[PDB]
Structure formats: structure tokens, C-alpha cells
Amino acid sequence: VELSKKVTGKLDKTTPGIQIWRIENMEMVPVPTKSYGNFYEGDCYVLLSTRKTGSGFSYNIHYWLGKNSSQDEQGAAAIYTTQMDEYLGSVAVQHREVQGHESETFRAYFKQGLIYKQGGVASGMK
């Protein structure tokens, strides 16, 4: 929720890799490298890639839209990516992905295998 503060504060600094955000239960969440890879398929996942450069770092915010949530959810994953795009310094970029758009791009950042669990992780009841 509101990536700002617990995210825009220090999305990624001096560290080549990527930090995704799980949109399970229709809500953004900080997905570090401890869970990166196995992300629900029916949801949304913002992936912020950061690389080193001669001037500083190059960020690349992505917005994965595992076609399952609702149109508003698409506005959410995109909003968080829009909050870190400016809070990062405008040096980041914006990318579009989906359940069939993050093919070699998503796996590209993941040189191994991307798993996909079941969305709706806020059930724990039904």
C-alpha cells in the first residue's frame, strides 16, 4: 500500500538487480529477492530494475498485469510505478507487461525460471 515511504524512500541504491512488488489480494507489496520469481499469475507485479552506469544508476520500472485483477488494479500497479518513477529522480523508465507480455523481458531480468502462484492471497478463508 502506498509504496512511498516504505519504497520511494530507498527503492534501489548501489545494487544491480530488481525489486518487484506483488499486487496480490489487489494490493501493492514489496517483493524483494527472497520471493522474486514465484509471483501469482492472476495479479499485477511492478518490477524496478536498476543497473550501474558511469553517471550513476539507470532505473526501469515495469508494470506486470497478470490478467486477473480488475481494471482498477491495472491503475494501481501503474500508480505505484508512477510514484517510484518520479520519486526515483525521473531517471527510471516505464515498461508494460502482462500474463503474455513479460515473456523474455520479465524472464530476462530472471536468468533461471519465473514461477506463478495463485493470485487472491488475501483469501486465507474462502
Domain chopping of the chain, boundaries = 1-126
Task: Determine if residue 118 is labeled as part of a ligand binding site.
Answer: yes
Task: Determine if residue 67 is labeled as part of a ligand binding site.
Answer: no
Residues contacting residue 60 through CB under 8 Å, at least 6 positions apart = 48, 49, 50, 51, 92, 93, 95
Task: Determine if residue 80 is labeled as part of a ligand binding site.
Answer: no
Question: Looking at the domain covering 1-126, what would its CATH class be?
Answer: alpha beta
Region label for 73, one of left (φ > 0), alpha (ψ between -120 and 50) or beta (otherwise): alpha
Task: Determine if residue 74 is labeled as part of a ligand binding site.
Answer: no
Q: Which of 85, 41, 43 is nearest to 62 (CA)?
A: 85
Task: Determine if residue 48 is labeled as part of a ligand binding site.
Answer: no
Task: Determine if residue 112 is labeled as part of a ligand binding site.
Answer: yes
Other CB atoms within 10 Å distance of the CB of residue 49: 21
Task: Determine if residue 111 is labeled as part of a ligand binding site.
Answer: yes
For residue 76, how many C-alpha atoms fall within 13 Å in the half-sphere facing its CB?
A: 22
